[PDB]
Amino acid sequence: AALLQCTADTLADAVLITTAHAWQHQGKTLFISRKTYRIDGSGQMAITVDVEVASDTPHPARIGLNCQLAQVAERVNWLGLGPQENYPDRLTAACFDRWDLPLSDMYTPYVFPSENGLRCGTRELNYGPHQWRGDFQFNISRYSQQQLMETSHRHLLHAEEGTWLNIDGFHMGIGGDDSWSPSVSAEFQLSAGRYHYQLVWCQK
Amino acid sequence: PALTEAKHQQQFFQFRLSGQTIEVTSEYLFRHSDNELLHWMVALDGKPLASGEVPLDVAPQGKQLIELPELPQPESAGQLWLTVRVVQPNATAWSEAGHISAWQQWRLAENLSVTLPAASHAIPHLTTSEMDFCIELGNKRWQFNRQSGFLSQMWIGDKKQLLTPLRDQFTRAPLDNDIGVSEATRIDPNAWVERWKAAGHYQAEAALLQCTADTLADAVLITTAHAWQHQGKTLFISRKTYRIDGSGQMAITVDVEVASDTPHPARIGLNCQLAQVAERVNWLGLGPQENYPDRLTAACFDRWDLPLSDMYTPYVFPSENGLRCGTRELNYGPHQWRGDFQFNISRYSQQQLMETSHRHLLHAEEGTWLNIDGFHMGIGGDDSWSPSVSAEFQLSAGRYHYQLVWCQK
């Protein structure tokens, strides 16, 4: 990521920050992301993200923003499809209700570790002090995405301090009919080339 | 307008493209392509860097592989477009020479531009009244009405740009398919028009949920929230923010929330009436035939120029018509529109179109009605009698976002 542009401005009731980032590989830009942060008098924070994906580039597996949080919580409470991990390609099993689970549960053990435990169509996500409001797909786990890709086996992974949190406006479909060849459906892939999602960061 | 769509789908030749290489498959059972000419033009942003023409020699059921000279690469931001069409060098008894049997369009690898608009020395100055919100930059003046919650007037000179305040429109004149067999004497529950009419979708009246005025150092930003309520039930909530550049180019971002219960809005768009009248409409998008999301296959993406009369499509029975889709930029007269949207520009108001029994009856309203839609519902339909619209085409998302830029000149 590089900063294409950045700015700071003050609303009478709130402060608004706008950041533009371009992701470039080999002189070619895979994605352009524009984010504006607006701060309420209440102090609740609203994030609006606009993502542009080049038509040429293979479609991004997911579009989301990921942060690492020092705080660790016993239980994760969210309102959305639950309680089993669900994906857009296979979200049929899940149903929408308030959900409470042990934090360990969110992670799904696999012999081979790949991104897992994703939850979809969640209006609000609650972990510890933080409250998240909006429509998004969130996976919350100790292990970093980079860590998950690296490890040969599930047993090997050691949880990083704090909890990694991922929030995705859109997630690519898991698939697949066939392991050998891509089994993902055409509709599921995020080929739109234009993407918009917004969420709110709220204390308590 | 539909007939062109039939021609494109019907055409015997099938084109599959991998990388530089283009492969053509012949529909024909019995005939070799004795006199077929294949022409390919590559253009960027409505401009073609190169044109390639190859003679075609495919036996019936035959597959012919054609490889382009390596395409020019443009540093400039934009999307490369490759268009291949087949024309007959010698006219058949039915067709004059230079007639085109088939065409195909493929996007080239996309280009994303990280170049930045900023910065412009001029800064917008806004003057506030209880009655109205006024923004002035240079000669141009922008007026927003607090009571209304929409900006009534756009100012040039020494001139007034628009007769009618810009507003969100969730309805389009009913298509033949939507109306179906439904009649005032014998209304049918199933028909799309009936669902909308029962909904109060047409009669819903906007209210200002909230409004505000703020000044950026380089720009002035206005935020309006509107709730459309019928019978104590809110069909849609729309939030719009207008940001004014130092350049004075204006950017609109619209967020629309639709209740899950309500029948899906036929279109989500904002429609305004403009006093100015222009001889020709120039836009970059699918062209030149009117196209809809359900049937946008016929249309191809290139810079398009047409007489203003052309945009309207004559119908014995008048329903919303002449819509254009996937248009990056729309140009009418002084105004420039930048973004991705579906636009129909016509003299007749949508309200007028729905009202009239016959096409002949309509009389053009002064100025030109302009409609811009972030998303448009699919026309359909397999059957007139029952809704033929596909499930995917309908805008059931319940969340919608689109943004466009209003630019002078």
Swiss-Prot record, chain B:
Positions marked as site (Important for ensuring that an appropriate proportion of lactose is converted to allolactose): 385
Outcome, altering residue 183 to D/Q: Small increase of the catalytic efficiency, when the sodium concentration increases
Top-level taxon of origin: Bacteria
Binding positions (substrate): 385
Outcome when changing residue 385 to F/G/L/T: Decreases affinity for substrate
Inducing or repressing factors: By allolactose.
Entry's family note: Belongs to the glycosyl hydrolase 2 family.
Subunit structure: Homotetramer.
Name by which UniProt lists this protein: Beta-galactosidase
Source organism of the structure: Escherichia coli (strain K12)
Protein's gene: lacZ
Shown stretch of the complete protein: 616 to 1024 of 1024
